[PDB]
Design a protein around this nucleic acid. Structure first.
Ligand SMILES: [Zn+2]
Ligand SMILES: [Zn+2]
Lengths: 906, 62, 116
RNA sequence: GAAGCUAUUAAAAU
RNA sequence: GUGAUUUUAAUAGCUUC
């Protein structure tokens, strides 16, 4: 009681013990430390403070707490001096220095239970079954009722989109903490005290409490290091929508919104004021317009801030910045500049306001530009979607339907005669041609609502991109001329509005090599926005989802080819690397891929995964990162200005552009387009980045005191240092980390698909990632929740990957050796046989190639333990004989022809 | 054997209805598509028969 | 490949001249000449110049919320309903849009209005 | 015939 | 009104060996 009343002191408050009498409590909380011995942000134990729960006049427990700390008499004498210097600041909690039994006691009064470190760790290391701290914080701060957690899948971003509002209820608290830390930094600077600011030394009210390691200097030379603080805090800002109060007048949530002018688009001063108000002591220089940046790293750094400041400004100030030129006296409306959400304002350099006449190149540019199409149209208001509706090109709305698939009665009846489709068969029909209604196209386009503005931890991303670029240093890239470009099928759509006059062959035949080169040189100094058309895809599937694809225009496709053709061909030609695009599964190409990933890992276990809605949810920061990584091969052919303008063109054409869906224009929030010239390679880059980030988080979130291996402990220490305390790139450590990854986390990547061989002891001890360290990374950097349904594990090597590229794996004997053979799904093969898209292809005697190709893919099943699986292949061989006999080469219906297709010798 | 016949017959029936210019009536096309998809996604013969005869009644009505 | 090109060249120019005749030159000139340097965002030209608006309504609740009555207001302007058309391109009168006839109606409806 | 090349058609994967 | 990329098969033609 004596200790309790001494702790109470002059601040009248009834306090109950929180612990065992007069002792020190033991709590488990998250900390951020960088000692010469241990470094990293993880959870540790605290036994140096005694807690004192506080009650009110109604004598029910409230969130106030009295925390007393017992430490070296030296800390006492010192902190006391520092607190005396920093007494006047309103962002500093109240301390009452005293001694009780004569051990010194530092009292911190009126503190919340949890800290910003706890909040940040809970949101950045989310686990579905270990979310007690997050649930308690949400309940305590009135973000949601205690019964909200009885709703299953409350944590999903897709099934429960109300969790976005529940999370956004914390924005005001986070903003208050930001303002208070700015106040504290200014106070230290005035006092002349240097010290490191960490999250764990700040309360959820924004009050600072630790002062042991603050060195005192002369007044006016105070230096507060906040790099780790701000970088670790960055991802939470957009998640909780901290800056949502800035859109009101005088930044007051009870006021009306600000009526911004419609003709204003600059916002440079607003961005600068926001930066100076919030990130005042951030050391690195900030460019509101990335056209003034100096490198790709600086572009990433500034665009990361731009994605956050862009939420304040109205959504109608982004897009092309049109003008009014006069062609031989005839006035036109052309787009000159462009306002990016991530790159600021870009102005074209070759602008001519008086064209005597326009040639083929100028006609192509003006026809691809959407300014005329949007200006000549009618206003559109579409309540079927939540996207911004730009205009309506026609006087009617177009509804697209999907027809059913045809039925092959001959093949079906032959299969019935051959004993398939019997009751209880493990082989059943699962793949069909699902039909859709009129509104399927717009309903599937509305799935872009899953794209949420995501801000990334920039200091972590800058090291991750450097590590990822090592995976692509074994290729050759650069720009090629117009006569070295290879186009596979010239009879394809040229996009809107070019598809009203011909196919892609017409324009390639019309414009010469000189004109193509001139257009490519134009794209390196100006921006050309283009319209994309969304088309429905008509295919066989196991789910009724109206899959839609984007048909990019010829003006974009041609110039992207002339920019990425060389690198993409080199990637497709290289064999035995991480990216396996171009490697055939025929002639042992499977075995050769599986041996390359098995490599020589020590305790091998296999794991794999796929992304939920990869194209719709992919953050724009990661998309720009992948584009910069691919464009890093142009160090000799293009300068910084040319590379930046090419990046701006790529963003304005395939990142957020006007999209045509049934005669109406809608703006794309972001993501990726399935019609790009670089879709698969960008997906591979994104996959590698997410895996590397998972590994970095798994290593850094581990207690360094429990790591027995001195090499690994030193590696973790230098990883933390090179990530948060070094601003330049350390090539030696980048190489060392890359070698560590290659030795213990091997990878095979094809777009959004990946198979991984890893050490199962390092994964057990927390030194490499797992399928839990990937739900956490996805949850905070991709705004999705990965379930156990897209995640598999295999502790065996004989049984290969559970699933890769839709094939399974088997270890069969081909002669004297054991090989691995990829076998697909019987149901898929039978469905492809029975249901066809064209009515003409139902004639068996006129389509032999279909069944020959289907038998090539169904051959492996002949060697499956399940007998009724192997009988699928023999069905196709007995049907091929019938087709030839009805028509009137024995090679097709002999097994050795197909057996020769999975044999090493070519 | 029981389910496969139902699903194939459903595919043929919806194709016939599409050829008979049912897309012109959006309200009919929506219900026909919904019944076809539910039959193709069904698991037991009980509900597939009911949705199949429901879809066949549309053809019998014209 | 030479006269094949000479066909599409006059097709692009014809389209690039037809759309100019559709521009609202009386109002567009004011918006352009009121900017700081004559440069304006594209997303506001239809909003502040379009003389015709098309609204697509999913169901009756949204209809009642948005396009109630003969005249409504949107985008700081007054629009007068001129015609309503269902998904079958059938003329729909304003009288049978209600609670009772909503199931009989074939949604969505495409409302066409003219600026005041 | 050995191999290469051009054209059309078809199947699969992302 | 029907996208980007990769592998494979079939028919046909041509030049080499
Ligand atoms: Zn910069
Ligand atoms: Zn280049």
């Amino acid at each position: 009681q004596s200790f309790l009343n001494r702790v109470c002191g002059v601040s009248a408050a009834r306090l109950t013990p929180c612990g065992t009498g007069t002792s020190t409590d033991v709590v488990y909380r998250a900390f951020d430390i960088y000692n010469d011995k241990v470094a990293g942000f993880a959870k540790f134990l605290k036994t140096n403070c005694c807690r004192f729960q506080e009650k009110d006049e109604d004598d029910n427990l409230i969130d106030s707490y009295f925390v007393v700390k017992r430490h070296t008499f030296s800390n006492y004498q010192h902190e006391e001096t520092i607190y005396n210097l920093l007494k006047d600041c309103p962002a500093v909690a109240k301390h009452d220095f005293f001694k009780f039994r004569m051990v010194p006691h530092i009292s911190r009064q009126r503190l919340t239970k949890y800290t910003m470190a706890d909040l940040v760790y809970a949101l950045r290391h989310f686990d579905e079954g270990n979310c007690d701290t997050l649930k308690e914080i949400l309940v305590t701060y009135n973000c949601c009722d205690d019964d909200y957690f009885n709703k299953k899948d409350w944590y999903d971003f897709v099934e429960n989109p109300d969790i976005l509002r529940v999370y956004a209820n914390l924005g005001e608290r986070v903003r208050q903490a930001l303002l208070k830390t700015v106040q504290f930094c200014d106070a230290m600077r005035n006092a002349g005290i240097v010290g490191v600011l960490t999250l764990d030394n700040q309360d959820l009210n924004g009050n600072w409490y630790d002062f042991g390691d603050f060195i005192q200097t002369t007044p006016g030379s105070g230096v507060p290091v906040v790099d780790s603080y701000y970088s670790l805090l960055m991802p939470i800002l957009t998640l909780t929508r901290a800056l949502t109060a800035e859109s009101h007048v005088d930044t007051d949530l009870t006021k009306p919104y600000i009526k911004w002018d419609l003709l204003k688009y600059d916002f440079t001063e607003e961005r600068l004021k926001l930066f100076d108000r919030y990130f005042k002591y951030w050391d690195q220089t900030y460019h509101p317009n990335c056209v003034n940046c100096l490198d790709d790293r600086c572009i990433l750094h500034c665009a990361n801030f731009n994605v956050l400041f862009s939420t304040v400004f109205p959504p109608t100030s982004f897009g092309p910045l049109v003008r009014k030129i006069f062609v031989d006296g005839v006035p036109f409306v052309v787009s000159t500049g462009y306002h990016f959400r991530e790159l600021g304002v870009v102005h074209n350099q070759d602008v001519n306001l008086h064209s005597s006449r326009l040639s083929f190149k100028e006609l192509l540019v003006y026809a691809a530009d959407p300014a005329m199409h949007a200006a000549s149209g009618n206003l559109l208001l579409d309540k079927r979607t939540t996207c911004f509706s730009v205009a309506a090109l026609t006087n009617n709305v177009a509804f697209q339907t999907v027809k059913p698939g045809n039925f092959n009665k001959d093949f079906y009846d032959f299969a019935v005669s051959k004993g398939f489709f019997k009751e209880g068969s493990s082989v059943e029909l699962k793949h069909f041609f699902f039909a859709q209604d009129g509104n399927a196209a717009i309903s599937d386009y509305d799935y872009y609502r899953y794209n949420l503005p995501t801000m990334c931890d920039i200091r972590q991303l800058l090291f991750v991109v450097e590590v990822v670029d090592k995976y692509f240093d074994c290729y050759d890239g650069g720009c090629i001329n117009a006569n070295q470009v290879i186009v596979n099928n010239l009879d394809k759509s040229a996009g809107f509005p070019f598809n009203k006059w011909g196919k892609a062959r017409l324009y390639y035949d019309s414009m010469s090599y000189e004109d193509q080169d001139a257009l490519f040189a134009y794209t390196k100094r100006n921006v050309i926005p283009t319209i994309t058309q969304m088309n429905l895809k008509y295919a066989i599937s196991a789910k009724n989802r109206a899959r839609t694809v984007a048909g990019v225009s010829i003006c974009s496709t041609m110039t992207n080819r002339q920019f990425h053709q060389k690198l993409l061909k080199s990637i497709a030609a290289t064999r035995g690397a991480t990216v396996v695009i171009g490697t055939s599964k025929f002639y042992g190409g499977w075995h050769n891929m599986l041996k390359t990933v098995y490599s020589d890992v020590e305790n091998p276990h296999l794991m794999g995964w796929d992304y939920p809605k990869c194209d719709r949810a992919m953050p724009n920061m990661l998309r720009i990162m992948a584009s910069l990584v691919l464009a890093r091969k142009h160090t000799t052919c293009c300068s910084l200005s040319h590379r930046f303008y090419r990046l701006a063109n790529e963003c304005a054409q395939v990142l957020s552009e006007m999209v045509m869906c049934g005669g109406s224009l809608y703006v794309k929030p972001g993501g990726t387009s399935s019609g790009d010239a670089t879709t698969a390679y960008a997906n591979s880059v994104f996959n590698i980045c997410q895996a590397v980030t998972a590994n970095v988080n798994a290593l850094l979130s581990t207690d360094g005191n429990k790591i027995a291996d001195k090499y690994v402990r030193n590696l973790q220490h230098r990883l933390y240092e090179c990530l948060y305390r070094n601003r330049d790139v350390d090539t030696d450590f980048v190489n060392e980390f890359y070698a560590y990854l290659r030795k213990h986390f091997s990878m095979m990547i094809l777009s959004d698909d990946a198979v991984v061989c890893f050490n199962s002891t390092y994964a057990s001890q927390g030194l490499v990632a797992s399928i839990k360290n990937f739900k956490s990374v996805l949850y905070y950097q991709n705004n999705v929740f990965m379930s156990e349904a897209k995640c598999w594990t295999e502790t065996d090597l004989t049984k290969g990957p559970h699933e890769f590229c839709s094939q399974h794996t088997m270890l069969v004997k081909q002669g004297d050796d054991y090989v691995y053979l990829p076998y697909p799904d019987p149901s898929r093969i039978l469905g492809a046989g029975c249901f066809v898209d064209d009515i003409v292809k139902t004639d068996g005697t006129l389509m032999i190639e279909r069944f020959v190709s289907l038998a090539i893919d169904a051959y492996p099943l002949t060697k499956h333990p399940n007998q009724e699986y192997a009988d699928v292949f023999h069905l196709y061989l007995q049907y091929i004989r019938k087709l030839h006999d009805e028509l009137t080469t024995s090679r097709y219906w002999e097994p050795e022809f197909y057996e020769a297709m999975y044999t090493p010798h070519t | 054997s029981k389910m496969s016949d139902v699903k194939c017959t459903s595919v043929v029936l919806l194709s016939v209805l599409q050829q008979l210019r049912v897309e012109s009536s959006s309200k009919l096309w929506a219900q026909c598509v919904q019944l076809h998809n539910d039959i193709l996604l069904a698991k037991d013969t009980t509900e597939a028969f009911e949705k199949m005869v429901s879809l066949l009644s549309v053809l019998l009505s014209m | 490949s030479e006269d094949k090109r000479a066909k599409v060249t006059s097709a692009m120019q014809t389209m690039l001249f037809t759309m100019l005749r559709k521009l609202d030159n009386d109002a567009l000139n004011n918006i352009i000449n009121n900017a700081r340097d004559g440069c304006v965002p594209l997303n506001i030209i239809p909003l502040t110049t379009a003389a015709k608006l098309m609204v697509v309504i999913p169901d009756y609740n949204t209809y009642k919320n948005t396009c109630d009555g003969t005249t409504f207001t949107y985008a700081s302007a007054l629009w007068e309903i001129q015609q309503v058309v269902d998904a079958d391109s059938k003329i729909v009168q304003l009288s049978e849009i209600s609670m009772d006839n909503s199931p009989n109606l074939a949604w969505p409806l495409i409302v066409t209005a003219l600026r005041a």
